[PDB]
Design a protein around this ligand. Structure first.
Ligand SMILES: Nc1ncnc2c1ncn2[C@@H]1O[C@H](COP(=O)(O)OP(=O)(O)OP(=O)(O)OP(=O)(O)OC[C@H]2O[C@@H](n3cnc4c(N)ncnc43)[C@H](O)[C@@H]2O)[C@@H](O)[C@H]1O
Length: 195
């Protein structure tokens, strides 16, 4: 089973706000440590690209800055894991869990996290990076009004996730401000402590 195989492979939740640099940092973790980077947003956007009726409904939700329903995103993530479970040296789950129920369901049905890497940026920094990214086409959810809704959703639903895992004792926090290299230096100090 999935649950059985995953007991021998580390799972790291990587959680931060929109434009926190979480994805950027996950790609550097892959380069250095050779974990599997799975992004729920990337999975959802591929389904938009497919032009399915579901992709249509997903673009509407993402373009409003809201959370896709839990079962839809958890099933896609699960499939992505099954596809790599026999070769993976470890999983970086980027952008899930984004609400407390998402963590509960994942742990009940898939597996338990070793670590939550909290990429902690301020909202002014987040807004700057997303407005900058929005100067090129490709992410229509970088619309300035959608940036605001994404930040609101993050503080309402996603910050409570950090506090939950903090109590459990698995949170390692990095200051997400500064250069990519300076943020990654912190990430490495924490990962090198365990890995
Ligand atoms: N679990 C879930 N449940 C329900 N719905 C879900 C879900 N997961 C996703 N969704 C849906 O999908 C949507 C999109 O989510 P995501 O795919 O996670 O997109 P995001 O919040 O923009 O983060 P992303 O990883 O792309 O960007 P990053 O912070 O790396 O920042 C990248 C930008 O910052 C720049 N940057 C990075 N580090 C920098 C640094 N140190 N200095 C300057 N710029 C930096 C980069 O160059 C780049 O421009 C959600 O809003 C939601 O609707």
């Amino acid at each position: 089973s999935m649950e059985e195989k995953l007991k021998k492979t580390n799972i790291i939740f990587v959680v931060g706000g929109p434009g926190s640099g979480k994805g950027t940092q996950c790609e550097k973790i892959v380069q250095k440590y050779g974990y599997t980077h799975l992004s729920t947003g990337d999975l959802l956007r591929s389904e938009v690209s497919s032009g399915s009726a579901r992709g249509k409904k997903l673009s509407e939700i993402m373009e409003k800055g809201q959370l896709v329903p839990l079962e839809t995103v958890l099933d896609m993530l699960r499939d992505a894991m099954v596809a790599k479970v026999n070769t993976s040296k470890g999983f970086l789950i980027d952008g899930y869990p984004r609400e407390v129920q998402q963590g509960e369901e994942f742990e009940r049905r898939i597996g338990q996290p070793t670590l939550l890497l909290y990429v902690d940026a301020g909202p002014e920094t987040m807004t700057q990076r997303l407005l900058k990214r929005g100067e090129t086409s490709g992410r229509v959810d970088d619309n300035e009004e959608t940036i605001k809704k994404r930040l609101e959703t993050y503080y309402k639903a996603t910050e409570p996730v950090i506090a939950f895992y903090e109590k459990r004792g698995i949170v390692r926090k990095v200051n997400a401000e500064g250069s990519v290299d300076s943020v990654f230096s912190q990430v490495c100090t924490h990962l090198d402590a365990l890995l």
